[PDB]
Design a protein around this ligand. Structure first.
Ligand SMILES: [Ca+2]
Ligand SMILES: [Ca+2]
Length: 149
């Protein structure tokens, strides 16, 4: 069996959920995004696990970030924080795309799921974003369900 065959799952959830923190820091003049952990991720490898990592894109180089890769887990702890230099008055114009990926070494990475937070989001995604906006210097966390895009 080839390396890449260990890394495939077809199929064919249940993609899991992610704990995100948001804080606008007036002292620092920017948004601090925390990727804390995920739970119950979908398995995208034949061992019944995944090698998760998380990418951030603030829309619309400096716009992107990505965590380290966790090996062989459906419940990764990341505890990473990322910073965007942006006036508070401009933060409502943006959308934060968050996507979780299964790293593979002999093929394309596998998509697990994502969420997008922003004023143009719906439900709990919007709520979390507005809350950060309406409450400076306060760390606001929230679980989000990972969706298909
Ligand atoms: Ca895979
Ligand atoms: Ca993998």
């Amino acid at each position: 069996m080839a390396l890449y065959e260990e890394e495939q799952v077809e199929r064919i959830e249940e993609r899991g959920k992610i704990l995100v923190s948001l804080m606008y820091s007036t002292q620092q003049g920017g948004l601090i995004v925390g990727i804390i952990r995920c739970v119950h991720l979908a398995a995208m490898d034949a061992n019944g696990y995944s090698d998760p990592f998380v990418k951030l894109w603030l829309k619309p180089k400096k716009a992107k970030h990505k965590t380290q890769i966790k090996k062989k887990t459906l419940n990764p702890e990341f505890n990473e924080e990322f910073f965007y230099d942006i006036k508070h008055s401009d933060l409502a114009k943006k959308s934060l795309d968050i996507s979780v990926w299964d790293y593979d070494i002999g093929k394309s990475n596998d998509y697990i799921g994502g969420c997008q937070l922003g004023i143009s989001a719906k439900g709990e995604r919007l709520k979390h974003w507005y809350e950060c906006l309406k409450n400076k210097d306060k760390k606001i966390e929230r679980w989000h369900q990972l969706q298909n895009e």
